[PDB]
Structures are given as structure tokens and as C-alpha cells.
Amino acid sequence: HMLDNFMKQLLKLEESLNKLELEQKVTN
Amino acid sequence: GPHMLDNFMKQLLKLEESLNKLELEQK
Amino acid sequence: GPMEEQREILEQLKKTLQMLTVY
């Protein structure tokens, strides 16, 4: 489907943000 | 529609820019 | 912080995605 690239990029960005969020939760 | 799509694509690029700054700081 | 702001932006873009159509 035509929106596929955008959706994939969004999922990848969330994957990256999840990693930052988990790091911060610990780090504090 | 096309306008919403355009804005979304631009916001995505900005989001990736923003996340990169956070990733580089953490690394 | 900036990270939490990006989470909000990301969650808004997930909402907008649901409205997006190519038709």
C-alpha cells in the first residue's frame, strides 16, 4: 500500500524512542 | 488527502531530525 | 524534556496516520 514507507518510518522512530525512554527510566 | 499527507511527511522528517539529536547525546 | 515532547509529537502523527488516505 501507498502509505507503507511512512508507516514503517513511524514504527522505526517509535522503536528508537522506546529505547531512549527505557534508558531514561533507568538512568533517573 | 494530499495536504495532510505533505504535512505528515514533513513532520516525519522533523521527528527523525529530533530523535537523531537525542540518539547522538545518548551514544 | 525534549524526549517526552517527541513522544507527544509521535503520538499525534499516529493519530494523523489513521486519517490519511490515498483515495
UniProtKB/Swiss-Prot annotation, chain A:
It is found in: Preautophagosomal structure membrane. ATG19 is important for yeast autolysis which is the source of several molecules responsible for the quality of wines aged in contact with yeast cells. Residues 3-28 form a coiled coil. Deubiquitination by UBP3 is required for full activity of ATG19. Induction: Translation is induced by nitrogen starvation. Translational repression during nutrient-rich conditions is dependent on a uORF (upstream open reading frame) present in the 5'-UTR of the mRNA; it promotes ribosome dissociation. Translational induction occurs in conditions reducing translation machinery efficiency, leading to ribosomes scanning over the uORF (leaky-scanning), and increased translation of the mRNA. Cargo-receptor protein involved in the cytoplasm to vacuole transport (Cvt) and in autophagy. Recognizes cargo proteins, such as APE4, LAP3, LAP4 and AMS1 and delivers them to the pre-autophagosomal structure for eventual engulfment by the autophagosome and targeting to the vacuole. Involved in the organization of the preautophagosomal structure (PAS). ATG19 association with cargo protein is required to localize ATG11 to the PAS. The coiled coil domain is required for the interaction with LAP4. Present with 1250 molecules/cell in log phase SD medium. Interacts with the vacuolar aminopeptidase 1 (LAP4) precursor and mature forms. Also interacts with AMS1, APE4, ATG8 ATG11, and UBP3. This is Autophagy-related protein 19. It comes from Saccharomyces cerevisiae (strain ATCC 204508 / S288c) (Baker's yeast). The lineage of its organism: Eukaryota, Fungi, Dikarya, Ascomycota, Saccharomycotina. The chain holds residues 160 to 185 of 415 of the full protein.
Curated annotation (Swiss-Prot), chain B:
Residues 5-27 form a coiled coil. It is found in: Preautophagosomal structure membrane. ATG19 is important for yeast autolysis which is the source of several molecules responsible for the quality of wines aged in contact with yeast cells. Deubiquitination by UBP3 is required for full activity of ATG19. Induction: Translation is induced by nitrogen starvation. Translational repression during nutrient-rich conditions is dependent on a uORF (upstream open reading frame) present in the 5'-UTR of the mRNA; it promotes ribosome dissociation. Translational induction occurs in conditions reducing translation machinery efficiency, leading to ribosomes scanning over the uORF (leaky-scanning), and increased translation of the mRNA. Disulfide bonds: none annotated. Cargo-receptor protein involved in the cytoplasm to vacuole transport (Cvt) and in autophagy. Recognizes cargo proteins, such as APE4, LAP3, LAP4 and AMS1 and delivers them to the pre-autophagosomal structure for eventual engulfment by the autophagosome and targeting to the vacuole. Involved in the organization of the preautophagosomal structure (PAS). ATG19 association with cargo protein is required to localize ATG11 to the PAS. Present with 1250 molecules/cell in log phase SD medium. The coiled coil domain is required for the interaction with LAP4. Interacts with the vacuolar aminopeptidase 1 (LAP4) precursor and mature forms. Also interacts with AMS1, APE4, ATG8 ATG11, and UBP3. This is Autophagy-related protein 19. It comes from Saccharomyces cerevisiae (strain ATCC 204508 / S288c) (Baker's yeast). The chain holds residues 160 to 182 of 415 of the full protein.
